[PDB]
Scaffold this motif. Sequence first.
Motif, short mmCIF file in Angstrom:
data_model
loop_
_atom_site.label_atom_id
_atom_site.label_comp_id
_atom_site.label_asym_id
_atom_site.label_seq_id
_atom_site.Cartn_x
_atom_site.Cartn_y
_atom_site.Cartn_z
N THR A 161 -6.25 13.71 -5.82
CA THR A 161 -5.74 12.99 -4.79
C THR A 161 -4.33 12.53 -4.62
O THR A 161 -4.01 11.41 -4.68
N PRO A 162 -3.53 13.46 -4.37
CA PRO A 162 -2.06 13.22 -4.14
C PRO A 162 -1.47 12.27 -3.30
O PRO A 162 -0.95 11.18 -3.73
N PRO A 163 -2.05 12.31 -2.04
CA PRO A 163 -1.32 11.47 -1.03
C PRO A 163 -1.85 9.92 -1.23
O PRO A 163 -2.90 9.69 -1.75
N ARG A 164 -1.05 9.11 -1.02
CA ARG A 164 -1.28 7.64 -1.07
C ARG A 164 -0.13 6.61 -0.70
O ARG A 164 1.06 7.15 -0.77
N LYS A 165 -0.45 5.79 -0.11
CA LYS A 165 0.62 4.60 0.51
C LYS A 165 0.19 3.46 0.41
O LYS A 165 -1.05 3.33 1.05
N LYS A 166 0.81 2.38 -0.09
CA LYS A 166 0.44 0.86 0.01
C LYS A 166 1.37 -0.01 0.74
O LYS A 166 1.24 -1.08 0.52
N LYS A 167 2.33 0.66 1.56
CA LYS A 167 3.33 0.03 2.11
C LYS A 167 2.74 -0.97 3.19
O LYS A 167 3.09 -2.19 3.40
N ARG A 168 2.07 -0.49 3.89
CA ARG A 168 1.24 -1.17 5.01
C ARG A 168 -0.39 -0.61 5.17
O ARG A 168 -1.06 -1.44 5.84
#
Lengths: 439, 117, 395, 362, 606, 42
Positions: free
Chosen positions: E347-354
Amino acid sequence: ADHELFLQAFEKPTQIYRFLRTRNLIAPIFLHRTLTYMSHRNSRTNIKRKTFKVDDMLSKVEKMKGEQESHSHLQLTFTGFFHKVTLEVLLVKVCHKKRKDVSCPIRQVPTGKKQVPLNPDLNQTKPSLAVSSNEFEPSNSHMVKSYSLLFRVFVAQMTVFDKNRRLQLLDGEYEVAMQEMQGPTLQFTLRWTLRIFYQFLYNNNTRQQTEARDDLHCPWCTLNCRKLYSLLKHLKLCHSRFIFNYVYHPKGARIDVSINECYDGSYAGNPQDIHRQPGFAFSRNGPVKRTPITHILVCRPKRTKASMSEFLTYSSGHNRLYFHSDTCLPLRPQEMEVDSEDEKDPEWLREKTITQIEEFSDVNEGEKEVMKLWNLHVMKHGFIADNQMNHACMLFVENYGQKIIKKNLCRNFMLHLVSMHDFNLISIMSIDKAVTKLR
Amino acid sequence: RRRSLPRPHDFFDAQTLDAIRHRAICFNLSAHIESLGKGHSVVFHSTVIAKRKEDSGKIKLLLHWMPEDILPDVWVNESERHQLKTKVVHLSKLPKDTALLLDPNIYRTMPQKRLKR
Amino acid sequence: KEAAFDDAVEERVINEEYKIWKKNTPFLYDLVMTHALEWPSLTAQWLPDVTRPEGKDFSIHRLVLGTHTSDEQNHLVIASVQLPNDDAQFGGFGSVSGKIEIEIKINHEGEVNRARYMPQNPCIIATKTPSSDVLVFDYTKHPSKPDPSGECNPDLRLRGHQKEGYGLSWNPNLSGHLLSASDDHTICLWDISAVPKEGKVVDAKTIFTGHTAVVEDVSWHLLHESLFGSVADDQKLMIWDTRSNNTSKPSHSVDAHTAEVNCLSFNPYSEFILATGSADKTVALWDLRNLKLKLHSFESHKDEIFQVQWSPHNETILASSGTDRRLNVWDLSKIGEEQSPEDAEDGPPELLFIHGGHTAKISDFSWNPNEPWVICSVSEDNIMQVWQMAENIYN
Amino acid sequence: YSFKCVNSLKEDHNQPLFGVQFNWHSKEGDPLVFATVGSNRVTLYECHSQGEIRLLQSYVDADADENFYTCAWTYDSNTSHPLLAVAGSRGIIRIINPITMQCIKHYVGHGNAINELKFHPRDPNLLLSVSKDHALRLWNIQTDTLVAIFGGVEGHRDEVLSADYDLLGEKIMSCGMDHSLKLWRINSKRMMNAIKESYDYNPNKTNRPFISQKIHFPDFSTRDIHRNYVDCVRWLGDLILSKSCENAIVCWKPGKMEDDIDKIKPSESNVTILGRFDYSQCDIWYMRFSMDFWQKMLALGNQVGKLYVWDLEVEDPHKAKCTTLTHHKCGAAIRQTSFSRDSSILIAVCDDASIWRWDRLR
Amino acid sequence: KRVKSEYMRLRQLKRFRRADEVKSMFSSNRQKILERTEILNQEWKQRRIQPVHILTSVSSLRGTRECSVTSDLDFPTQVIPLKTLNAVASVPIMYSWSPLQQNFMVEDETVLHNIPYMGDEVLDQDGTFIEELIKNYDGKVHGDRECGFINDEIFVELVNALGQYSDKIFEAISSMFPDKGTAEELKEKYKELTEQQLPGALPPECTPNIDGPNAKSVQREQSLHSFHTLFCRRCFKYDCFLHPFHATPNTYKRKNTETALDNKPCGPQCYQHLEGAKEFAAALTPPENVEWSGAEASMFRVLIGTYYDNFCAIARLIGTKTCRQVYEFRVKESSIIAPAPAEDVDTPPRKKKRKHRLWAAHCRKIQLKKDGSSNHVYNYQPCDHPRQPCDSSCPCVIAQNFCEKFCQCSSECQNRFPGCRCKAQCNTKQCPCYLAVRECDPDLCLTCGAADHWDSKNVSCKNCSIQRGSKKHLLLAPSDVAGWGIFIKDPVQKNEFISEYCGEIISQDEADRRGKVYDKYMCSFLFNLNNDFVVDATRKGNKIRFANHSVNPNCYAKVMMVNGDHRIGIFAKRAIQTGEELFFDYRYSQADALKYVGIEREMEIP
Amino acid sequence: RPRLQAQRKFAQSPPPATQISDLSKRKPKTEDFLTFLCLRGS
Ligand SMILES: Nc1ncnc2c1ncn2[C@@H]1O[C@H](CSCC[C@H](N)C(=O)O)[C@@H](O)[C@H]1O
């Protein structure tokens, strides 16, 4: 049907205050003249200054005008007896009751016994004497009470000094009736050398009709209340065991009494001594510990005027006594600090996990042993979180390492770590640490 | 409050009620406070005591009262005969030092024997 | 023994009377505030200095007590008290959390029986003597929290006594002078004005013995630095003058009540008057010049009296307490005053209102020198009470 | 062995009585003094012979409408005095000394009403108390302390109304509303350790309160023995004498026939019935029973006052005995029986506040 | 039926057989009766007792009450004045209870096992209440009216009356005796009897213990089968008392890269460091001189699933195994067994900014609109079936709860929250967990510090106390209103924690069954917990239950979910000083509240 | 049904008004009236 239940209910409030009447008249807990609503008494207004240089001169003048009593030696002569014999008399000095004396001690001084006629008839006289020593001194007789005289034949007693240390006797012939064992007697002589009504309310379907007399005087504490309002107010204040309601009688006033519905504050001393068995309860021989309480009832009353129309509590403390939750046992105030009687690992659940794990069929004690022990540990420390259990396994091994090493249950204990890692609870590194500490 | 608030445990236990009940009987059959004592007073009954002869023909009389709570016997005039047979003393004018002897529930030292002073 | 049955019955009676008094308090007192303590206190002496915080309607007072522990270590204690110092100071009246505080607690070897502070320096208080030695405590240096590591190491201890005593009074005119009584029939003189050397033990300056029975109190005259009265249990009090170089010849040969006498106190606002209370259920006042003559004796109590207090705010107001479970205030101005039979049957005219807010013997009591009328009273029942009369009796 | 009697009593207060116990601790030749309980008064009685029953001063707790259900005799080891322990509906146990005619100790801690009590036959200062709140309270009279409880849900789940010791005082059997019959062993090490600590505790000695414990788990449980509410238990050697309102007293033991009474674990639930007795009109509960000291003879009261008496031997329970004694005026209910130290005197309770004394023809 | 008669005849034959057993047992126990009563009699003869005095009267008997005892026959009516023994302050009514600080699920068997006592007076006027009570379960009673109970042989011979015709015979026997009550269980009973054994108090495959003397080699799943069936994941404790065992085993993936097995010499005993053995290990990435026993093989089959990579650790764990022989044994096993997949995902993609804020915003609409109209809050039940990945058939979705760590949803499922973002005492409106009326679970809320200072019981993070279990100090005392009460010895401020209303987690049906007797007994303890569970505290709990309810309570009780379980929390409505009884509103129905809890503490003072 | 019924535990089956002398009629309810008005107070 009988009304004895009503009389029994009202008798306990009755006789209590009836005896309190005598107790307070002998020993007033407070002066009734000093009550705010009883203030019609105590007419002596505080207006004087009373400089300390007026009572000394007045006392000196009174002492100069006093000293009415006088004395020199006391003597007496015996005439005889009479009945329808040698006689013995004694001198007694009495000292006032001291702290170590239960009552006022009496000390007797012997004298010379003589003979008396054995009930002589008329005109039988045709010499026995007793004299007292002038040993009365202010220094020697400061602590003594009023002196007395002993007579025996048949024993009699009679004093000499009055209440104010004055002589109560005189030089003259005395005819004394003797308290043997008209009648027995002894003869000798001495020488010197609106209307109100009442109503009782309980089970008001029927009642015993009542009437009132001596209106201004309370029926219980016989206090003359010259103000009608103050009478009811005093009844309210000193007789909580009754509830009074006023109704205007066609020929005056009327008060209806009724037993208190709640009547709280029955006991106010140390709560620890309420439930204790007799003998050790209300001892007060030595100091006893009670929980600190603060109670306030008067801070600044409004001091309203005496109004008839008025007739138709802060506390921060433990107060009530506390009981053990588990056993319903009263709790000692000193044990109060740490007797939380509640902890994460009850013993009953400790035995419950053992019994239920061992009870199941399709599993043997070879695995049920560790199944039981792990539950005991985790419930002993009450772990909740996953990172908490990662060290819960470590603490299980820490608690039981020597026991397991002497027990050799490593292979069975390995099943616990396998299940731990199968649930991702225990990391690979933490697997080995449960082995090194095992031995 | 509400309609059915419980009554706290009355500290005045029933055996104390029995004790005060018997005290009521004894005081109603001994002094008759309600009738003779007028509720607020205790009647004292004098008896025949010694009579002393003074210089005059009249004899000074002596009277001692039956209860003998705190009063000392004091000499009285000849007119006291048949006039001071019965006297009623209010509880207040009884002496405040030795009148506790009429009944020891009226007053007693609660510590009694004191370990301390 | 039938004593126990009567004791229990009268215990219920005194409970009933305490309840009846409690409900009569608002129309009897202008201020009733009762408190309970962990251990009883035998000393009740208001500290002279009282702080008055602004804005709020109550003042911060301080009161000296002493823990009488029958099981554990006793502690010298100083308890603060809040009082409604405002005309309109009507939960209660001030802060609803800290009307009683135990902020000062100091370890003490044995219980405290009669503690009396310094007029010259209230920080120095003597705990009397539940021993043969009189201890000196300075509450400023001692920690607020009582450290259980033995006694609090008192700054000074006084030698001279052998058995326990219940009399104590500091010199109001001379610095560092104390006299105390004991069952050894003796009163010891101490000079605590100068203790330069080490050892922290001050011997008795001069032993005084002129009584044939137990001495129980001693007090100095407020207008006489050298003349001090003493009282003993041999039905005799005796006035002693220092500098006489005689430990047995009194300055004035006088005699006390017909029974045991345990307290002796002078009035600050006079040069001659002296008052004392005895176990004869009577309190009598004497004079320094009218020794032999008897002015008056007070016959309101029913048991032994061992505490007398002249009101600091007046010259003619006196108060006394004893085992009678009552507290009496005396107004000498109304002595022998004629009154109606209703007033007389309640009590003698000179007797002011009789305080009855206690269930045990009033161990000690005092009046604070700040409020015109203020007085506390302690008891062995741990019943701590501060009470005030309704103004109607003294306007 | 056959009992005959021409005598009866009746108390004036007329509410039912709930137990009588004889002072078996009385020495040889002492008058037969036994206690009676019920109707807010503890009425002691004295019996010598000829049908005469002499009353002792009754102690009344007139402070409330208390109902009394418990009497139990014991002796003071320190002073050799006969003590009686009484507990009632208020959940309060009272100890009254007849020698001084005044109470000495009371005990509080019961959450609900209290049924009949029995004293430890080996240690006189130990008293076991049943309770309406499914609990079992044991006490140490010599120190007035509370010792281990048997009150957990693992124990009885409803109103406990019977308990008893064995002859040696090693195990405790009790029954309750939930038809359960459970065994608690006093001879378990924890129990005598607790008893010894109870005798060693004084409140002034230490600030720490006496650390009691909770015994939730008995050593045995069963329900199928009686389909109705079992209300009375007694001990017969290792056997159990239990009665329920199926109109039959039964005999049984935990485990199998050969199973040891001491090694049986709580896991085992085998129950073997090796005795049963029959009678008539056992409809209303609380109809308890008791044996003589020697256990040779048994009787049980009936609601019509019939006294089914049976002599106990090694014979078969089927034809053990068929002896019944009854008086024409004892039609009132009966809820408790009691025997003297010997079988000479049997005295029971009733419902109309009447006391009946049965005399043995020995 | 004749089945009962045949059973009675067989039991009579068995009793004829045991007529000697009963006689011998009676004789043996009578010997012990004599030998244990003679000692007691002799002990009584040893010492002396003071006899009781005759009846006497005190001088106070004139004012005291006097009683009389009459006799039916010609005996004097003896009289004696009563002795008024001193009274005591009796405690209010209470019912015993095992103390605990957690919950305890109770089986919902519809067996009364008692009939509670009732006044016996209203029943004569109307005895229908007990009928309504028993009809709720079924019109029966414990034991019913069959009045039949015999031994196993007698019960078997009951069917022997019609056994020559069996199913009908077994049905007749079941109708005769309610102990079994079913002809179907007769099949299993006969199978066990023919086997002359049982599944056994051990693994059924002839092994008493895998670690015992029967060191038989077994597969990985069978060894942990008894372990995992009795291991509950929820409470983490084996044989849970508040969670069912109806759950899948630990068939979950793991960070397989952790077992790197870094190249290091393991000494002469090593499955590596040998040219042929190392080559085989590299391919699998001489025969053993010592043959590993069955225990070694069984433990290897288990430890392979955990430590595939490094042979040294596996050899270190197994006593009967050597790392030098580890390669040979692994080769033999892989020849005789199969390897494991050890699944893992990237699961490469990830983002926790928003994305966290976007998911939090999405949760609010569901919890307010889509959950406020449900009128029910179902008990937390993790879903572990891929039949509905974040779909309308996962129990966590239909119950509108959150697919937390304990649910087997995806590791990044949007139906879960990242815990408390705020460090502000987790109780303000800025706290997501306080907003979601749920205690913050420490392993996710790294901000408020619930996991921080685990040993500390004075956490600055409010709304996590039940997880920490740091209840305040509470003291029991009688209540001035009714029954017992709970009083606190320390002051409590706004919204401070007081102990949980612990009890028994039972279903709605069982709780309603208990309510029928609670209403009559007047001492109820039931107010709803969730649409599936209602907490009953009559048998277990703590001092919280003693808190009463008034129209102006000093506390508030909000039913609130903790770590996938609903717990009744108690918090103070206003600041309460020392020595005040705790009152929290029950949210009680007005009519039934005035019927039950209508007693008020303070009247209309103003 | 026989074992289902409730356990009933049992079988089915001076007047005129008086002054404060009436107060003297209730403390000493026996042992003589101590005053003639107690008889009128009954
Ligand atoms: N304020 C109150 N007044 C009267 N009964 C109350 C009450 N609060 C609760 N109860 C009763 O108590 C039960 C709730 S548990 C309350 C405390 C505990 N039952 C006790 O008595 O100590 C309910 O069945 C209710 O009937």
